[PDB]
Amino acid sequence: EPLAAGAVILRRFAFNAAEQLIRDINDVASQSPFRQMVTPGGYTMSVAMTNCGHLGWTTHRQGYLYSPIDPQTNKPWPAMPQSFHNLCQRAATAAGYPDFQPDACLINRYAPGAKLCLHQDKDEPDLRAPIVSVSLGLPAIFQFGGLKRNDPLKRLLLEHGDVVVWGGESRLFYHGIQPLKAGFHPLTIDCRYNLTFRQAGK
DNA sequence: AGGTAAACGT
DNA sequence: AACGGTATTACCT
Numbered sequence: 549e550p551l552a553a554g555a556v557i558l559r560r561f562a563f564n565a566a567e568q569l570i571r572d573i574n575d576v577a578s579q580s581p582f583r584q585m586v587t588p589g590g591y592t593m594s595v596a597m598t599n600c601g602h603l604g605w606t607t608h609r610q611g612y613l614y615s616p617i618d619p620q621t622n623k624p625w626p627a628m629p630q631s632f633h634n635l636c637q638r639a640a641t642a643a644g645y646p647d648f649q650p651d652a653c654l655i656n657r658y659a660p661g662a663k664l665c666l667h668q669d670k671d672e673p674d675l676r677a678p679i680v681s682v683s684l685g686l687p688a689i690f691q692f693g694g695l696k697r698n699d700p701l702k703r704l705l706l707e708h709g710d711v712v713v714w715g716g717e718s719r720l721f722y723h724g725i726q727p728l729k730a731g732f733h734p735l736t737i738d739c740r741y742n743l744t745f746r747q748a749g750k
Numbered sequence: 751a752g753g754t755a756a757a758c759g760t
Numbered sequence: 761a762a763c764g765g766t767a768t769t770a771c772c773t
């Protein structure tokens with residue numbers, strides 16, 4: 549019944565914290581605005597993104613990279629809000645990863661139709677640390693597979709406040725998001741946000 | 751050697 | 761529309 553070895557879903561874990569989380573997303577984006585990044589191959593992603601914390605995930609021509617500087621503003625990413633950090637630590641603890649210290653939070657925003665094709669999170673040098681993923685606003689279908697792209701997928705609806713954590717044996721599993729269905733949510737109005745916490749540095 | 755980008759047709 | 765090809769290569773370090 550558990551998501552996978554080392555992996556768990558904490559349904560509605562972030563429900564009570566969500567209004568403050570969303571105020572702080574708005575604050576982060578007021579400094580480093582959401583933008584749709586362009587892949588190395590030249591395609592614009594459907595998800596709009598920004599980052600907070602000491603390191604931010606970015607693409608550039610040469611690949612994927614963590615950087616301490618937002619290439620759009622040329623200034624450091626905004627500091628990680630304490631609300632984000634406190635929620636992360638509680639969720640990580642509840643999921644069995646009490647020692648997790650993220651230094652990076654990638655904020656994804658899904659408009660209707662936006663998706664994330666199956667991928668692995670492998671840009672982090674220390675793969676001992678888990679990923680903590682917090683869903684806010686409109687629901688989305690999350691794909692969670694195995695070590696190989698063709699391993700069979702579990703498909704789970706992720707609703708507002710749901711937190712998923714993966715690590716250990718499932719750290720490098722393929723995962724993704726199916727094209728967002730249009731809808732209404734009273735706190736985000738017409739979108740989904742996802743916060744993805746990582747330990748990106750050493 | 752090995753790391754690793756990947757987001758159209760059936 | 762769920763599944764899988766593509767990187768079965770071309771380039772870095």
Ligand SMILES: O=C(O)CCC(=O)C(=O)O
Pocket residue numbers: 654656664669681683690723724725742744
């Ligand atoms: O949006 C999600 O639920 C997953 C996001 C994700 O996998 C990523 O940003 O790497």
Ligand SMILES: [Mn+2]
Pocket residue numbers: 667668669723
């Ligand atoms: Mn991911």
